[model samples]
Target chain A: HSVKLRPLEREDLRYVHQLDNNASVMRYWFEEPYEAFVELSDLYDKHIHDQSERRFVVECDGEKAGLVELVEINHVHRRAEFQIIISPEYQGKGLATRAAKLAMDYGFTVLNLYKLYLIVDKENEKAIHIYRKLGFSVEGELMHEFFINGQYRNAIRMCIFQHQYLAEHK
Target chain B: HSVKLRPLEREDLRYVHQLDNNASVMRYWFEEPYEAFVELSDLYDKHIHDQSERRFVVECDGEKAGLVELVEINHVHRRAEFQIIISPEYQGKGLATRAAKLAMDYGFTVLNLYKLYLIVDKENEKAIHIYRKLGFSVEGELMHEFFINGQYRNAIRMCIFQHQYLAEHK
Candidate 1:
């Protein structure tokens, strides 16, 4: 796989602004798109040293491909919330899955985290399939957790534990 | 049915200290039972005006019966996480059920929240029944989300929506 995870540097903010402002990409994030660059810059500075989060850029062949993150990282509980956003040009290239695996490996192996969990819209079957193939299991099906597009949406909470992740690889 | 909710006052800190320091109670909360009065006092003053949470003391027969709280109140999402605790002496008196109902009503009616959710230990079937009886449905079963008593514990995430509550009651 040519995709690798790299530290999201200050230089990447412009690229991030591109993705953060794209409603199609930010839809999975349950966030309002069209964020100002100044606010994004300020947020990057604010969270640059935040121990509770790990933000990374997905790079492929030395070009920015997408974003992968482990946010709400809790050291005491040994768990974190995982999320990803692939640039429009990078979709369907198997980049998101590879980037996610790299980030998960870092979290489970390097960070010594016990678990990585995520919330995905239940209707996003394609992403859910990728997560399932990656060994993530549905922990719970949350109902009407998000309101979007004039309708309440159901969500699936999924998780993969360190021991479980390590079991399949070796 | 005598349970009522009263604002948790500065005087109630003593009562909170008792429940918060009890391992058996905080176990459900996935928090360590050890806390200092200084920290607790500082936290009260810190979170007193926080719009993101609502903490109320459950009163019955003119005595503090236990604690009930709606934390992480996300107004934009119109949802909150709910938790309750009854003093050991007050347990088995049906106070928890009534107090939970009062809190749920407040959350749905007074606060105009769209949903209330909670996480209960999967093994705590007794409390699970109470939540189910109160119109909460098990949204998902999470595995090993909490490390407790030298082992990982499973939890059940439950939720109830405001429209559902209104339809059933009125």
Candidate 2:
């Protein structure tokens, strides 16, 4: 099925929180799984309730398939970072890239960010492909940056500035 | 400054040979520069001149700025790995990203590549940024993958597939 994106509403807090605490989904990015869904829901409520950040429910066939967030809103630099995750069942269908492009367009157009950035584990080829498709470039690599599953992994800084995005679209 | 890519020709032999032997320039990718320009030129003439891989002379302001090569033709995967270098003076500008996008287009359209891959030193942040800007993602990091300057360095593997590239341009 094709993918779509919608803003995270109060109704989505339940599944979003469940997805957040899922051991398989959050294993790589977070060190430990959330002990309770309510805790995760509260965290999501606190974050999604904020004006500076925006979260989205990635939809596939009318069901919530993933999550996306625009974070670190820097008004001075007119920039922010992004984080995304696709439910295990819904991955490998180019959904992440589609959601990312949508969020990037919103960041540059509505939010008027001069740049948007993200950091991804160097070994996560699937996630890396999605970021690259959205025009993020590797700014640097932090060696042994993240400890995941008892292994040290590198994290790469990637960004897309306004000028480059303008040139490409034009 | 604006950028253009032209085919490497006989007149470029001297500069190409000089780059081949420039110790500073080779330091990042190779352990040592070639001992002699003649040896390098002879190899360049044989492999680059008649080879399907088109080596281009990167030009900025009507002068030779750097070099780029399309190598390791993989018919099954329908892709090639791209290698690029810009003279130290030309490094700061956005030339690398622009040049890479052009080269990638060439690879996908002209060379019929389904994917393009590049391996970069884990410590080379500048090159990593440029590659990312052009839409490549970090697939993995091989620790102590290659020996350079009498020490081992990690190699970051990155690539862009045809579907994602086409979507980005579209």
Candidate 3:
């Protein structure tokens, strides 16, 4: 019944590396699927102080279950792009929903951001539906925004602004 | 009286470096105001094979007057982010409009993209007016999307789909 988020540590790259290499996982990530551990290590070091992104590991019952990120943070616009990934073993356990809530709170409350947005494969309406139920609204139907798995893919851009999220939750 | 676009060869970088360092030119770019030639050169080489972006020098009357780019080109989504910079000497002469037209055509007609979008400082209603006149529709009024010169700035996210562009042009 408890879910928590902790700052990602260097050691977690091994876990992140495994997820980055997963086929089903990276397909919708819209980024090239396979990443060597070295690449992940280098990227981590590169972005260590960039302040453009924040990453966290999700824990349920005190074990790592997933990753959540509020990336491409534009402090100028008070906005950021949101993303999440739950281990396959943790899928269907409602971990994503809880994990997402934790991250969103950090953005709106602690981080004092004005807006949070995301893009998801339209084919994954289930994921989109979950976001909708989580207080996000559809922004646009972007066509063919992703190329993956031997063909192109369409996507949905969705967002939640600070004022809106506050009113709904309050 | 004619505006044309040619591949962004390394030779043009000397010109690009100047523009990248202009306070006025880069204020709206929402990126750091200055770049090292070494960094810019390295970037050009890095993206040479990465089709995610395309760059061109806007040549008018057979001389380089500016730069236009259809960057973050998501071939999968058939969409790209658009940007432009006209030399101060060429301002108020409608060069921006012409340069943008060439880039849009290349993205829609030659690159075969489905959509094109841009971001601009909201304070620059004049530029926004120009884009609207060029057939872009304002998608959203993004708040504080840029931080420049000691404060946050708002912006507009505008777009035009291929079908809309084709219909209007024809």
TM-score of chain B in each prediction:
0.96, 0.90, 0.96
Worst 10 residues of 3 chain B by lDDT: B138-147
Candidate 1 lDDT, tens digit per residue, A1-170?
47788899999999999888788778788887778999999999998779998899988998888889898888877999999988898789888788888988989998899999999999999999999999998988889888766678889999998998888776
What is the total number of backbone clashes in candidate 2? 4
Against the correct fold, how does model 2 do in TM-score? 0.49
Better of 2 and 3 by lDDT: 3
For model 1, residues B144-168, the per-residue Cα lDDT tens digits are 8888888988999999999988888
- What DockQ results for candidate 1? 0.78
Q: List the residue pairs that clash in candidate 1.
A: none
lDDT of 1 at A22: 82
What DockQ, on C-alphas, does every prediction get? Answer: 0.78, 0.01, 0.34
Model 2 stretches with alpha carbons more than 4 Å out: A1-170, B48-52
Docking category of candidate 2: incorrect
Residue pairs with backbone overlap in model 3: A76-B144, A77-B144, A77-B145, A144-B76, A144-B77, A145-B77
Model 2: pairs clashing at backbone N, Cα or C within 3 Å: A137-B132, A137-B133, A138-B129, B78-B114
A46-141 per-residue lDDT for model 2 (tens digits): 775576788788888898889888887766546687788888888888787777777887788779887777877787787777778767777667
lDDT tens string, model 3, B28-50? 67878779999999998998898
lDDT by residue (tens digit), candidate 2, B130-150: 778777788666444445666
Where does candidate 1 chain A have its weakest 10-residue lDDT segment? A144-153
Please rank every candidate by lDDT, starting with the best. 1, 3, 2
In order, what lDDT does every prediction score?
0.88, 0.75, 0.85
